[PDB]
Design an enzyme around this catalytic site. Structure first.
Site, mmCIF file in Angstrom:
data_model
loop_
_atom_site.group_PDB
_atom_site.id
_atom_site.type_symbol
_atom_site.label_atom_id
_atom_site.label_comp_id
_atom_site.label_asym_id
_atom_site.label_seq_id
_atom_site.Cartn_x
_atom_site.Cartn_y
_atom_site.Cartn_z
ATOM 1 N N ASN A 263 0.928 -1.042 0.030
ATOM 2 C CA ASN A 263 0.082 -0.105 -0.189
ATOM 3 C C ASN A 263 1.012 1.230 -0.193
ATOM 4 O O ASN A 263 1.421 1.398 0.963
ATOM 5 C CB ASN A 263 -1.029 -0.046 1.363
ATOM 6 C CG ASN A 263 -1.704 1.105 1.321
ATOM 7 O OD1 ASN A 263 -2.079 1.783 0.298
ATOM 8 N ND2 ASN A 263 -2.362 1.306 2.466
ATOM 9 N N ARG B 223 -2.612 -2.270 -3.286
ATOM 10 C CA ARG B 223 -3.988 -1.392 -2.929
ATOM 11 C C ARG B 223 -4.022 -0.237 -3.838
ATOM 12 O O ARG B 223 -3.085 0.593 -3.634
ATOM 13 C CB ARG B 223 -3.932 -1.047 -1.318
ATOM 14 C CG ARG B 223 -5.205 -0.088 -1.118
ATOM 15 C CD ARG B 223 -5.334 -0.162 0.103
ATOM 16 N NE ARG B 223 -6.462 0.579 0.681
ATOM 17 C CZ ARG B 223 -6.566 1.946 0.625
ATOM 18 N NH1 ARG B 223 -5.872 2.550 -0.323
ATOM 19 N NH2 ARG B 223 -7.604 2.546 1.320
ATOM 20 N N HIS C 79 -13.400 3.095 1.118
ATOM 21 C CA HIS C 79 -13.105 2.170 2.027
ATOM 22 C C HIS C 79 -13.932 0.760 1.365
ATOM 23 O O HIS C 79 -14.541 0.001 2.116
ATOM 24 C CB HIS C 79 -13.931 2.698 3.314
ATOM 25 C CG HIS C 79 -13.177 3.573 3.762
ATOM 26 N ND1 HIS C 79 -14.009 4.816 4.683
ATOM 27 C CD2 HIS C 79 -12.114 3.614 4.579
ATOM 28 C CE1 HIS C 79 -13.023 5.617 5.233
ATOM 29 N NE2 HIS C 79 -11.872 4.780 5.327
ATOM 30 N N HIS D 46 -17.734 2.200 8.602
ATOM 31 C CA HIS D 46 -16.428 2.152 8.827
ATOM 32 C C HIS D 46 -15.934 3.529 9.787
ATOM 33 O O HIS D 46 -16.030 4.517 8.770
ATOM 34 C CB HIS D 46 -15.576 2.119 7.626
ATOM 35 C CG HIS D 46 -14.452 2.167 7.441
ATOM 36 N ND1 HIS D 46 -13.576 0.739 7.437
ATOM 37 C CD2 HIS D 46 -13.274 2.658 7.765
ATOM 38 C CE1 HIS D 46 -12.272 0.749 7.515
ATOM 39 N NE2 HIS D 46 -12.140 1.955 7.752
ATOM 40 N N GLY E 188 -12.804 5.027 11.180
ATOM 41 C CA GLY E 188 -11.567 4.790 11.420
ATOM 42 C C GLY E 188 -10.861 6.436 11.492
ATOM 43 O O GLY E 188 -11.626 7.327 11.730
ATOM 44 N N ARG F 195 -11.028 15.958 8.791
ATOM 45 C CA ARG F 195 -11.733 16.411 7.896
ATOM 46 C C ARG F 195 -12.948 16.778 8.060
ATOM 47 O O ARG F 195 -13.787 16.187 8.901
ATOM 48 C CB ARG F 195 -11.662 15.106 6.619
ATOM 49 C CG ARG F 195 -10.488 14.703 5.933
ATOM 50 C CD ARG F 195 -11.033 13.863 4.993
ATOM 51 N NE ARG F 195 -9.927 13.408 4.346
ATOM 52 C CZ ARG F 195 -9.375 11.721 4.044
ATOM 53 N NH1 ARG F 195 -10.346 10.940 4.591
ATOM 54 N NH2 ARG F 195 -8.480 11.398 3.419
ATOM 55 N N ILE G 114 -12.311 3.254 15.186
ATOM 56 C CA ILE G 114 -13.288 3.692 16.402
ATOM 57 C C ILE G 114 -14.281 2.695 16.485
ATOM 58 O O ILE G 114 -14.535 2.556 17.478
ATOM 59 C CB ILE G 114 -13.770 5.278 15.848
ATOM 60 C CG1 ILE G 114 -12.566 6.035 15.780
ATOM 61 C CG2 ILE G 114 -14.661 5.529 16.640
ATOM 62 C CD1 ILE G 114 -12.784 7.332 15.271
ATOM 63 N N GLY G 115 -14.846 2.270 15.338
ATOM 64 C CA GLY G 115 -15.975 1.504 15.337
ATOM 65 C C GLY G 115 -15.846 0.171 16.116
ATOM 66 O O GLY G 115 -16.590 -0.349 16.891
ATOM 67 N N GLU H 62 -8.409 -5.501 5.601
ATOM 68 C CA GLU H 62 -8.310 -5.415 4.447
ATOM 69 C C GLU H 62 -7.243 -6.125 3.629
ATOM 70 O O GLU H 62 -7.399 -6.224 2.589
ATOM 71 C CB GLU H 62 -8.086 -3.610 4.348
ATOM 72 C CG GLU H 62 -9.231 -3.060 4.292
ATOM 73 C CD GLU H 62 -9.152 -1.405 4.915
ATOM 74 O OE1 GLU H 62 -9.125 -1.303 6.265
ATOM 75 O OE2 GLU H 62 -9.450 -0.502 4.247
HETATM 76 N N1 LIG Z 1 -10.268 2.674 22.755
HETATM 77 C C1 LIG Z 1 -10.406 3.525 21.679
HETATM 78 N N2 LIG Z 1 -11.241 4.288 22.094
HETATM 79 C C2 LIG Z 1 -11.680 5.395 20.899
HETATM 80 N N3 LIG Z 1 -11.026 5.334 19.820
HETATM 81 C C3 LIG Z 1 -9.968 4.585 19.465
HETATM 82 C C4 LIG Z 1 -9.659 3.703 20.414
HETATM 83 N N4 LIG Z 1 -8.496 2.782 19.812
HETATM 84 C C5 LIG Z 1 -8.469 3.378 18.843
HETATM 85 N N5 LIG Z 1 -9.297 4.350 18.349
HETATM 86 C C6 LIG Z 1 -9.352 5.238 17.448
HETATM 87 O O1 LIG Z 1 -9.152 4.963 15.984
HETATM 88 C C7 LIG Z 1 -8.908 6.126 15.361
HETATM 89 C C8 LIG Z 1 -7.828 5.597 14.243
HETATM 90 O O2 LIG Z 1 -8.744 4.936 13.463
HETATM 91 P P1 LIG Z 1 -8.107 3.626 12.353
HETATM 92 O O3 LIG Z 1 -6.966 2.970 12.906
HETATM 93 O O4 LIG Z 1 -7.596 4.660 11.067
HETATM 94 O O5 LIG Z 1 -9.039 2.900 11.704
HETATM 95 P P2 LIG Z 1 -8.965 2.169 10.419
HETATM 96 O O6 LIG Z 1 -9.722 0.730 10.092
HETATM 97 O O7 LIG Z 1 -7.671 2.130 9.827
HETATM 98 N N6 LIG Z 1 -9.671 3.444 9.015
HETATM 99 P P3 LIG Z 1 -8.814 4.186 7.652
HETATM 100 O O8 LIG Z 1 -7.781 4.787 8.398
HETATM 101 O O9 LIG Z 1 -9.838 5.404 7.253
HETATM 102 O O10 LIG Z 1 -8.741 3.225 6.512
HETATM 103 C C9 LIG Z 1 -8.138 7.123 16.244
HETATM 104 O O11 LIG Z 1 -8.841 8.318 16.336
HETATM 105 C C10 LIG Z 1 -8.238 6.298 17.598
HETATM 106 O O12 LIG Z 1 -8.316 7.145 18.884
#
Ligand SMILES: Nc1ncnc2c1ncn2[C@@H]1O[C@H](COP(=O)(O)OP(=O)(O)NP(=O)(O)O)[C@@H](O)[C@H]1O
Ligand SMILES: Nc1ncnc2c1ncn2[C@@H]1O[C@H](COP(=O)(O)OP(=O)(O)NP(=O)(O)O)[C@@H](O)[C@H]1O
Lengths: 393, 393
Positions: B8, B82, B171, B199, B201, B232, B323-324, B377
């Site tokens: 990636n 990717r 995503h 999703h 993140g 964003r 986050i989710g 992914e």
């Molecule tokens: N225990 C937690 N509580 C709240 N937020 C968390 C926790 N652990 C991780 N995060 C959040 O996850 C966010 C980062 O998300 P990410 O790691 O990017 O998911 P992803 O699957 O990689 N999505 P993307 O990066 O757009 O493809 C940050 O704001 C973190 O604070």
């Protein structure tokens, strides 16, 4: 037999109506248009009288002479002014005083064209009718109950705190009037109720009314956000706009014109901003008109459903505005798009023309009542004016 | 013991993973970062090795030497790349040939930075591994089933027909992988099913999956549309942006930086793009962090509900992404915001950490099943590569 003169100054026009206080029915209506070398006054849609290079004051003196001619002048007990944007300063309609005016001017950078025309109308009316009480009714005030989670943009805080960048919303006077009529029509307790109102006219917007208060709405800081409309884009990816700018060397200024004046049903269809023309085109085989209408429908459905999230319970979905009142087809296609909410249409009720006024169009098994309630902003304005006519000023 | 090397390339970095074909588990992961005077390679998060003013080819030869050192080179049976944006040209993952490459270049003006890094990775990998089959997996391809009513902007047709201005969505690989896992977890018939996947993140988006196919999604032509995110803005009124430009004399270019890099949770909070920091700030009394999180929640709810409109029936709502998967609080506040859909939370299930993997968090009376399904992914990419490894090329 007192009457209320209701005044609406747009960029280039003064629309007015005179309402019988007793019936709140319209006695006379009219427009001074092209406010341009070619300025004219038409009353009850008739015989344009020529005005000079007339300013707003001259045009209003003309309207006032038309009232003099008909012996209405001394009946004018109240004058109500429609104001486009009240900012965060106005949460309800007000008696116009010097303070009110200064405050309208303070919020006016948020809708420079419109609010300055509204202020010209107020100045003119004050000069022509100094001994008549006048009231200002704001198209944004109903939405001032939105919580910050619903009105904030995800922009730096300073844009909000120092420039007033937030969602305001519009059609407030229609959403208010229609939601009040809905509690009667649907026999709902105002204080424990959830409604979505779809104002579909040339401009279009959705409003979620929870326990009597607007808690979400689709238009933004400006009327450009939300639903796709006749010539307005509705929601558009800022990234796409910036990419279009770079790729076509259009300035922000070009793009502003495109998304306001060349977009929406007109932009997709290539044909008209007018829905009845696009339906006729679709009937004749025109695929881009079909697509313009399908997209318009899809965006309505998507906003109606999303506004439902602001409610604890969904009791009713109400259509209003020229399209919402008259388009049997738009209503049906929107409601079919919301099958996921458990909606059922009564296609007999839905076929009724708008002469039938306030009417339920959902069928008995429906999870959510669906209705059509014609909007009447003039009336809502006259009602506020009448109420404010009882107070000391 | 064949493996798949998954690559990636971002604007400034090459992330990679090596996946055991048998377990599809990760055997090694790493990054070449600052691709800047200070370019370094860290593997399994360790001992940055210094790279020169190294280009993508040099950096990949480095990664390749790290594999040589560990005797993996000859195990590399497939390489998966990717790709950020496939336009309207790619509706599924593909074996990389010269034609594929030319077509990636053709869509590359839609994501100039990212796609050119993806193409550099492909060039480098082809040079380093000429006898290994390579596959391209596009972050937009899952969304190519959107109907025009869902992908068209309300802009003039020519922007679509001659420049490819339409919603693409992102995503895709996560939304696809998670929806497939949901049919198992929820025991749903793929062919008669309605899911919403959130999703959440660093980037965030919503996808509506109807009968196995993406039928609506929240990001746009670019990743800037939809949900408010870490830095964003998400959805923003184009009118407000144009008004901000005029009022601050910022150019489109300034604004692009603001809405990408300074907005969202960071912009509202004044504090961090990081959700865990904002929660800690809220716990300590910080009102702007509370407001940033409430607004993030509200926008999620509003998009989830609005995406439901594209479904004939709503069976499940699935949280995923960092986050989710990890935010017990975000999930609960979103679900409470969707009470209108008849959701019920099982707060015991919801409290479970993400070590618990694929898990139902809604309670028995719920009208809609709610779940958390960790996204993967890398795995989805390796699965496509493995499948394509069975064909003649
Ligand atoms: N225990 C937690 N509580 C709240 N937020 C968390 C926790 N652990 C991780 N995060 C959040 O996850 C966010 C980062 O998300 P990410 O790691 O990017 O998911 P992803 O699957 O990689 N999505 P993307 O990066 O757009 O493809 C940050 O704001 C973190 O604070
Ligand atoms: N029978 C009909 N079928 C479909 N559309 C109709 C019909 N009659 C009127 N309209 C549409 O109504 C639209 C104009 O709506 P409008 O008259 O602006 O409502 P409104 O209440 O004034 N909203 P706004 O102008 O934003 O405050 C046009 O596109 C017309 O085609």
């Amino acid at each position: 037999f007192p009457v209320v003169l209701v005044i609406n100054c747009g960029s280039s026009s003064i629309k007015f109506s005179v309402l019988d206080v007793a019936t709140c029915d319209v006695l006379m209506a009219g427009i001074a248009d092209g406010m341009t070398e070619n300025a004219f006054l038409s009353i009850n849609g008739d015989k344009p009288i020529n005005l000079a290079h007339s300013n707003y004051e001259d045009a209003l003196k003309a309207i006032a002479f038309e009232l003099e001619k008909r012996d209405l002048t001394d009946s004018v007990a109240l004058i109500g002014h429609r104001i486009a944007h009240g900012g965060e300063l106005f949460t309800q309609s007000v008696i116009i005083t010097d303070e009110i005016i200064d405050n309208i001017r303070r919020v006016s950078p948020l809708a420079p064209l419109h609010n300055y025309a509204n202020l010209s109308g107020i100045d003119a009316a004050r000069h022509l009718f100094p001994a008549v009480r006048q009231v200002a009714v704001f198209d944004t005030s109903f939405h001032q109950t939105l919580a910050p989670e619903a009105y904030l943009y995800g922009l730096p805080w300073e844009y909000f705190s120092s420039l007033g960048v937030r969602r305001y919303g519009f059609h407030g006077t229609s959403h208010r009037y229609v939601s009040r009529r809905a509690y009667e029509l649907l026999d709902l307790d105002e204080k424990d109720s959830g409604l979505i109102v779809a104002h579909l006219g040339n401009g279009a917007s959705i409003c979620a009314v929870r326990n009597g208060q607007s808690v979400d709405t689709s238009m933004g800081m400006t009327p450009l956000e939300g639903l796709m409309m006749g010539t307005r884009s509705g929601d558009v990816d800022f990234g796409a706009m910036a990419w279009i700018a770079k790729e076509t060397g259009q300035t922000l200024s070009d793009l502003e014109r495109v998304v306001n004046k060349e977009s929406g049903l007109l932009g997709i269809s290539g044909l008209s901003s007018d829905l009845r023309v696009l339906e006729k085109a679709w009937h004749e085989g025109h695929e881009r008109a079909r697509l313009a209408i399908k997209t318009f429908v899809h965006r309505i459905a998507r906003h109606i459903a999303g506004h439902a999230a602001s409610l604890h319970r969904l009791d009713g979905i109400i259509f209003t505005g020229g399209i919402g009142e008259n388009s049997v087809l738009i209503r049906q296609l929107v409601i079919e798009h919301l099958g996921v909410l458990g909606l059922t249409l009564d296609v007999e009720m839905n076929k009724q023309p708008n002469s039938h006024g306030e009417r339920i169009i959902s069928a008995n098994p429906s999870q959510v009542i669906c209705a059509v309630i014609p909007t009447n902003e003039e009336k809502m304005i006259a009602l506020d004016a009448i109420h404010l006519g009882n107070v000391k000023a």
